[PDB]
Design a protein around this ligand. Structure first.
Ligand code: GTP
Ligand code: MG
Lengths: 142, 143, 13, 141, 165, 585, 415
């Protein structure tokens, strides 16, 4: 179960939170501040995973933007990184040359892309074609 | 890149070596490891421009610890400039003398310090008084 | 300074 | 070249933020006399570019030229056809009689996630020995 | 616009003849720990002069000028026979370089007022100047206290710099 | 009203965060004022600009009602904005989110599947336990549909309501019956994750669900044998997301069964050999494959192969795989216990790795690797590794030293020796919670307290500032003081026990600021016991109790006065209750 | 006692670095900002930090962190007074002091760091005399640099001889929520603008109470200065004797003196405000502003800053005279009145709404600060009597003054 997802910049500037676990905003602002501090204080050969407080916290840098998940401590990890990468692919799919500044701008659909991909903390479409198809149709619905 | 900079640093024209040493302490301003070019800016130190000599004094003080052995290429130039009739250039050397911390150097500089202890202008004498404590900071018993 | 000045005496003996 | 100092880092930033690789019409500044970039002013400018710095060895391009030339016209009053150079074959020599700079060939987050050109050279005899005239004799009579 | 050096073992009067050429005076100078540099305008060629003293701690530090280096002057110390041998091993250390290749050799017979000083032929034969391939050398007798022999060596050096009328 | 990206561009020009807050409250007021206008036009964008500020971390409690208006809108984009911030601004404890319940229920009956997709999205992400109680029949109704766009969504939404309401899954036992033949993989994936959830909660559901184990053994074998599809394929590996979930469902099934464990045995022997271990994907396939084999009563030829799979994974230079391999043996500690023990030096190697998590998994698995055979040698590595821990691992190691030592200590003396070693070298890192445990085991120890209390005394003269160290000592001095100072009622030949510096070292704690006052709580307790445990020099210690009756700690002001009346009125009743404490477990 | 004085930015990268002893490592600066991130986010912020034995004395400019580092028991006020002086001298050189001022002008700024301080010992910090041999456009140092008179160079010559004084009042006020005045002191400050020829010794006299008590005129109008802090140039030993304000001024604008006194008379303008904060509903501010000061006097361009709630919305303002701007960016209202004479009393009735949902957290109570300015009006009643121009050449200067009364800290604690 993905407990939440964080996308924060090279400066730590969070471009996405998605709490699949219900914890209050002070706790949201506390925990988010810590893990950004944790990941930015972490090197490049540090196994792309953090065992953070009963959350095998998954991080995987792809660009200046950083990435974060909190998986349940009974689940898979490399696939959890592949979940990020499949979502990276879907961001690479729906955008193409997927890039930093419309993460800042067109984030609203990046949530919607996540809504077409992960609801509840888990995957609903294991295809990469059918999901971006559906969001285009709802975009074709406008 | 730095060699083209060292080409302009080993130039004979003033306007090329003046802009070269500005780029060095601008590279030092942006915090570049410009310590490798140490004894080469030392060649364009003994200059008639007093405005330029402060930049090298800025460099030599900053990279004295980095190049302690290469810092022996300034002792003659300090005792040269403790004697020029501008009191501005004498006290400028004196405060550059005491802040440069290489123990290979501080034994040689006590006499132009002693010279500037009994200088005339209040400007260098209030500068030379602190350089004693700078020397006593470096080598207390030599004082 | 849009406000104007006022002249004081010099000595006040 | 006094008011060309206040935009000397400002417009060059817009040049450097321009990639080297609404609006309609053309306004003219009222009552300001206009003249082309003359010889001695190009000597005044080539030394203004020699002294103020930040130009030599920079990646020249056409977008940077047009940012620069219109800014000269709107702030100094000079016809923005003076920064013309010889075309592709050969060294990009200036057609301008007095421009002592020839053109020899040589942000960061706008990049995507996973990825699925000239420069100046000072030549003070371009003001007298028009080398672009040697590259284009039949056009200059 | 051509540069020139003043190297060699110390206590040889080279900073004396430096400011004899620069000013024209016999100057009071410490044993030169760092270096000296001024320039001399003579025969319309700027004899820019680089002195480096001969202390032991500044013996390895001669290389830091050897980038962009066109001339050479070795100042012998012939009043010291016990130190002309280590100055000779100093000379073959300096002349065994592939970086100093355009530099013509220019020996100054200095301190020419003592009768123990040799001529311009014995010092040549003791040091082995003839065995120096790709080395255009010429020994020059320079008395420091008077100033004679200085500008004639600067004449031959000016014939080593330019090769014109 | 300006657009979103126009606002963001202004926000991207902000330098100081305080200056940025000025730009926030600039626009935020216009968002508020527009909300006072009850606008429906820019209510799309004003909420969108607000959610940005919410993502920027600003108090956007006020616009939440407008989100309910955007859910209760009629335009699709206003819904498309409205369902989003409902997942953002509202949670279960938001307490105003209950008004969605009618709105979602109408929009579970909306004509557009995408509107219903938005409704299943928002309820699936953050549907409240009572909202889950109020939408349960509608989700299974949208799970009884044929729209695979909705069947993929109502399945995971049904997981959510079973996650939120655990007593609700019994109406989904009929819902899940025989939809396991879905041609789509995504709906079939969500059904597996649902059947992962359904098998997770109730053991009573396992009987109905272990029946269809060979059904999916076929379908998983179909995934291996359909080696390519244009979708689902990453690096030549077809639908690995579904494949792991089947294995995880095959992990929780057959874990105490054998017939289903043999019904799944073949494809386990297949994909342990029929995987491409080149890319990250096939390792992720093979990792769960290892974990599936360990947790079921599997074929023994699988598990021997599986350690040989892991012996490869121990030696891959990918720290991912090293994190994977260390987690793997951290899982199957007890299961196939000795095939782990032959990989012991690999674990001691990863103590010297330069990653926190790798050193974390190695230290904890070393805490798991300790049997009664490696107890002597490995602790010497670990007590050395305790010296070579990070301060974050120093608290973690020193406790985990104490855990395995209480298990498999071959001696009671050597059990004391290592703990006394750790208490000297952990200090501020060893937790105070293990101190009653250490106190219990040394009074579970019955035989070496003359051995213990002297070594306790020999290190506390070194320091006191190690607070959990001197937590341990003061109870031992109070209880086993007779074994420290022995037969020394008067002055004798000087032995190291001297019954006055014994009393001074506790008095040194009482005045020292580096005392946790339960140090001083234990100390007066030790003072009052040594009125009885010592016959040597009492009533000089009464002075120390009597001067402490004006102390500033509340209980330690209680503790001294409650002692002192026994020291002043009931001197014979002092020893009448200072019998040693009983020993429990 | 400094060892290495650094300048950081809002990000913590070194704008400019300069050591004076070498006793603090140059890479110690990179721990400061995370410790600054540490101490602030735990609320343990102090102007001195410590990474082991390196002590981090710093001030904070608009962008800048003038971090002066040391290790020993350095003299602390020696550091920070120099820190505001370096800000001041840079403000004397660079009309704004930001990242553009540093990175474009490192030619002069490193020379300033060489000049202002040696070893940690500030020796020359008067910027006006420093302009004469440290230029951004070198000769010998001036004699005024050597001289005990270190603020005024000789040979300064003008066509006219103008002495421009600015007796400036600054009314502090602390009114509680009870409506009583807690603390209303007045910090007045006479700042001089001298345009004079040569080396004059100016001797000033006021309506000092003590000087009138020494004269025997302690029954007439005499201001009572509780403490003054003067310029260096005032010979304080001459002032200690007999209240004698005797000095050689520098040339140009400078604050000579800084007097401070308490005053048990009313505030010049009394404010009555109310708050009808209706829960989840709205808020109302029926605020009036009566002027207690003199009717001939007029409070120019007053700016009444009343802190409103953050989620306050739908503003309504029933003023009498003067406009309101609502500043949600400061979460407040500025009921601005340009001309507000003494004796006048203008009401303003504010009305917002409030969200029917509550907010998450508290806000606290900022007081109300207004921005009055009354010219030609000494509330303390200070009067310059004369100004003795004493020149060896001898001239008749033009001494001039104007009186301006403004707020100091004009806080009035709200409901
Ligand atoms: N009698 C006599 N003494 C000389 C003559 N030339 C140089 N000397 C002596 O040699 C000493 C060395 O001269 P300097 O020029 O001061 O020192 P240097 O040879 O340059 O040695 P460094 O300073 O280390 O480079 C001087 O102190 C003179 O006394 C000379 O022509 N006649
Ligand atoms: Mg010499």
């Amino acid at each position: 179960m993905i407990h939440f997802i964080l996308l924060f910049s090279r400066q730590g500037k969070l471009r996405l939170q998605k709490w699949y676990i219900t914890l209050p905003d002070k706790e949201r602002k506390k925990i988010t501040r810590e893990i950004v501090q944790i990941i930015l204080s972490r090197g490049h050969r540090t196994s792309s995973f953090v065992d953070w407080k009963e959350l095998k916290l998954v991080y995987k840098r792809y660009a200046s933007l950083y990435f974060c998940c909190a998986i349940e401590n009974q689940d898979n990890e490399l696939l959890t990184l592949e979940i990020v990468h499949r979502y990276v692919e879907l961001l690479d799919k729906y955008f193409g040359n997927v890039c930093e500044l419309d993460i800042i701008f067109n984030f609203e659909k990046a949530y919607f892309i996540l809504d077409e991909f992960i609801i509840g903390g888990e995957i609903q479409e294991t295809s990469k074609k059918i999901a971006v198809k559906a969001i285009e149709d709802s975009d074709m619905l406008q | 890149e730095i060699f083209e900079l060292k080409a302009e640093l080993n130039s004979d024209k003033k306007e090329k070596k003046k802009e070269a040493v500005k780029k060095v302490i601008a590279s030092m301003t942006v915090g570049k490891d410009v310590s490798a070019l140490f004894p080469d800016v030392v060649n364009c130190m003994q200059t008639d421009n007093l405005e330029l000599k402060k930049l090298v004094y800025l460099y030599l003080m900053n990279y004295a610890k980095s190049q302690p052995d290469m810092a022996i290429m300034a002792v003659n130039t300090f005792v040269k400039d403790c004697e020029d009739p501008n009191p501005l250039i004498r006290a400028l050397a004196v405060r550059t003398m005491g802040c440069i911390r290489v123990d290979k150097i501080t034994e040689y500089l006590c006499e132009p310090l002693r010279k500037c202890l009994k200088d005339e202008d209040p400007y260098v004498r209030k500068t030379a008084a602190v350089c004693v404590a700078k020397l006593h900071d470096i080598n207390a018993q030599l004082v | 300074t849009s406000y104007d000045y006022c002249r004081v005496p010099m000595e006040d003996g | 070249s006094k008011s060309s100092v206040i935009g000397w880092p400002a417009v060059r930033e817009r040049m450097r933020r321009a990639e080297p690789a609404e609006e309609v019409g053309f306004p003219v500044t009222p009552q300001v006399p206009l003249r082309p970039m003359t010889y001695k002013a190009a000597v005044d400018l080539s030394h203004f570019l020699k002294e103020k710095g930040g130009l030599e060895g920079l990646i020249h391009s056409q977008r940077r030229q047009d940012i620069l030339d219109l800014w000269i016209y709107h702030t100094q009053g000079y016809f923005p056809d003076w920064q013309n150079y010889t075309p592709g074959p050969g060294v990009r020599y200036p057609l301008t009689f007095g421009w002592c700079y020839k053109l020899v060939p040589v942000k960061g987050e706008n990049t995507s996630l996973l990825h699925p050109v000239l420069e100046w050279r000072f030549d003070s005899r371009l003001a007298f020995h028009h080398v672009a005239r040697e590259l284009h004799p039949e056009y200059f009579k | 616009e051509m540069r020139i050096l003043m190297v060699g073992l110390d206590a040889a009067g080279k900073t004396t003849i430096l400011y004899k050429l620069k000013l024209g005076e016999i100057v009071t100078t410490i044993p030169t720990i760092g270096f000296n540099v001024e320039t001399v305008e003579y025969k319309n060629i700027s004899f820019t002069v680089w002195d480096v003293g001969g202390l032991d701690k500044i013996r390895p530090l001669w290389r830091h000028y050897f980038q962009n280096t066109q001339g050479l002057i070795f100042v012998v110390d012939s009043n010291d026979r016990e130190r002309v041998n280590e100055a000779r091993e100093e000379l073959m250390r300096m002349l065994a370089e592939d970086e100093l290749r355009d530099a013509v050799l220019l020996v100054f017979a200095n301190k020419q007022d003592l009768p123990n000083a040799m001529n311009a032929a014995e010092i040549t034969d003791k040091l082995g100047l003839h065995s120096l391939r790709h080395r255009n050398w010429y020994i020059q007798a320079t008395c420091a206290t008077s100033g004679d022999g200085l500008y004639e060596g600067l004449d031959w050096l000016s014939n080593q710099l330019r090769n014109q009328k | 009203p300006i657009r979103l990206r126009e606002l963001i561009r202004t926000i991207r020009t902000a330098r100081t965060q305080a200056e940025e807050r000025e730009m926030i409250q600039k626009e935020c007021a216009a968002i508020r004022s527009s909300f006072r206008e009850e606008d429906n036009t820019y209510r799309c964008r004003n909420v969108a600009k607000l959610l940005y500020m919410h993502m920027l971390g600003y108090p956007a409690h006020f616009g939440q009602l407008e989100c309910l208006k955007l859910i209760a809108s009629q335009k699709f984009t206003d819904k498309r904005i409205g369902y989003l911030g409902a997942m953002l601004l509202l949670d279960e404890r938001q307490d105003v989110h209950l008004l969605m319940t009618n709105c979602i229920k109408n929009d579970l009956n909306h004509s557009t599947q995408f509107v219903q997709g938005l409704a299943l999205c928002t309820l699936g992400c953050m549907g409240s336990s009572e909202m889950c109680r109020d939408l349960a029949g509608e989700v299974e109704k949208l799970l009884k549909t044929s729209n695979s766009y909705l069947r993929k969504k109502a399945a995971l939404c049904a997981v959510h309501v079973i996650r939120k309401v655990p007593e609700l899954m019994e109406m989904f036992l009929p819902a899940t019956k025989n939809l396991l033949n879905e041609k789509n993989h995504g709906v079939l994936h969500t059904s597996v994750v649902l059947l992962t959830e359904m098998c997770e909660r109730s053991p009573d559901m396992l009987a109905h669900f272990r029946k269809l184990v060979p059904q999916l053994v076929r379908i998983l074998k179909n995934l291996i044998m359909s080696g390519y599809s244009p979708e689902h394929d990453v690096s030549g590996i077809s639908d690995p997301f579904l494949q792991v979930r089947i294995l995880r469902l095959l992990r929780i099934l057959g874990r105490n069964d054998d017939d289903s464990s043999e019904a799944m045995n073949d494809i386990l022997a297949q994909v342990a050999t029929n995987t491409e271990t080149s890319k990250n994907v096939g390792n992720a396939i093979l990792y769960e494959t290892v974990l599936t084999i360990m947790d079921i009563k599997s074929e023994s030829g699988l598990r021997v192969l599986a350690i040989n799979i892991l012996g490869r994974f121990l030696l891959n230079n990918d720290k991912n795989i090293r994190y994977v391999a260390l987690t793997s043996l951290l899982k199957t500690v007890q299961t196939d216990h000795n095939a782990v023990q032959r990989h012991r030096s690999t674990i001691v190697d990863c103590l010297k790795d330069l990653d926190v998590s790798i050193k974390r998994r190695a230290m904890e698995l070393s805490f798991a690797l300790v049997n009664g055979n490696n107890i002597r040698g490995m602790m010497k590595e670990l007590l050395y590794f305790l010296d070579s821990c990070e301060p974050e691992f120093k608290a973690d190691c020193a406790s985990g030293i104490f855990l395995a030592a209480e298990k498999y200590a071959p001696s009671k003396r050597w059990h004391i020796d290592t703990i006394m070693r750790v208490l000297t070298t952990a200090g501020s890192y060893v937790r105070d919670d293990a101190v009653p445990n250490l106190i219990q085991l040394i009074t579970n120890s019955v035989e070496m307290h003359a051995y213990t209390v002297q070594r306790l005394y020999k290190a506390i003269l070194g320091d006191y500032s190690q607070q959990p160290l001197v937590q341990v000592a003061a109870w031992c001095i109070g209880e086993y003081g007779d074994l420290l100072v022995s037969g020394q009622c008067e002055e004798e030949e000087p032995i190291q026990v001297t019954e006055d510096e014994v009393l001074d070292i506790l008095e040194s704690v009482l005045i020292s600021n580096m005392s946790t006052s339960v140090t001083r709580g234990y100390a007066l307790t030790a003072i009052m016991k040594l009125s009885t445990r010592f016959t040597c020099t009492v009533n000089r210690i009464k002075k120390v109790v009597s001067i402490y009756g004006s102390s500033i700690d509340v209980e330690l002001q209680q503790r001294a006065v409650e002692y002192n009346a026994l020291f002043k009125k009931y001197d014979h009743m002092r020893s009448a209750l200072l019998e040693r404490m009983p020993v429990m477990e | 006692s400094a060892s290495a004085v650094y300048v950081l930015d809002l990000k913590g990268k070194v704008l400019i670095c300069r050591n004076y002893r070498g006793d603090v490592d140059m890479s110690e600066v990179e721990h400061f900002m995370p410790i600054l991130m540490e101490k602030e986010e735990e609320g343990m912020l102090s102007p001195i930090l410590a990474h082991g034995g390196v002590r981090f004395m710093w001030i904070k400019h608009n962008n800048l962190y003038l971090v002066a580092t040391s290790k020993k028991n350095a003299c602390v006020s020696l550091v920070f007074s120099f820190l505001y002086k370096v800000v001041q001298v840079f403000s004397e050189y660079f009309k704004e002091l930001e990242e553009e001022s540093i990175r474009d002008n490192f030619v002069i700024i490193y020379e300033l760091l060489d000049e202002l301080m040696d070893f940690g010992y500030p020796q020359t910090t008067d910027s006006k005399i420093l302009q004469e041999y440290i230029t951004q456009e070198a000769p010998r140092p001036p004699a005024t640099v050597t001289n005990a008179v270190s603020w005024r160079s000789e040979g300064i010559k003008y066509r006219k001889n103008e002495v421009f004084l600015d007796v400036i009042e600054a009314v502090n006020l602390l009114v509680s929520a009870n409506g009583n005045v807690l603390r209303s002191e007045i910090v007045g400050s006479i700042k001089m603008r001298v345009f004079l020829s040569g080396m004059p010794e100016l001797r000033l006299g006021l309506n000092d109470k003590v000087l009138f008590d020494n004269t025997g005129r302690g029954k007439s109008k005499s201001v009572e200065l509780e403490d003054v802090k003067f310029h260096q140039c005032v010979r304080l030993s001459r002032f200690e004797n007999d209240r004698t304000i005797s000095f050689i001024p520098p040339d140009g604008e400078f604050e000579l003196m800084s007097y401070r006194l308490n005053t048990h008379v009313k505030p010049l303008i009394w404010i009555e405000s109310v708050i009808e904060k209706h829960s989840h509903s709205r808020i109302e501010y029926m605020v009036k502003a009566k002027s207690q000061f003199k009717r001939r006097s007029t409070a120019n361009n007053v700016e009444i800053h009343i802190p409103v709630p953050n989620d306050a919305d739908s503003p309504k303002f029933k003023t009498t005279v003067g406009s309101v701007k609502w500043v949600p960016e400061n979460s407040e209202i500025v009921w601005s009145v340009k001309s507000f004479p003494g004796g006048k009393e203008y009401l303003m009735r504010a009305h917002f709404g409030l969200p029917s949902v509550e907010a998450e957290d508290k806000e606290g109570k900022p007081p109300i600060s207004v921005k009055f300015e009354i010219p030609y009006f000494t509330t303390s009643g200070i009067q310059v009597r004369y100004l003795k121009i004493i020149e060896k050449s001898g001239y008749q200067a033009l001494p001039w003054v104007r009186y301006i009364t403004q707020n100091g800290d004009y806080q009035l604690r709200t409901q």
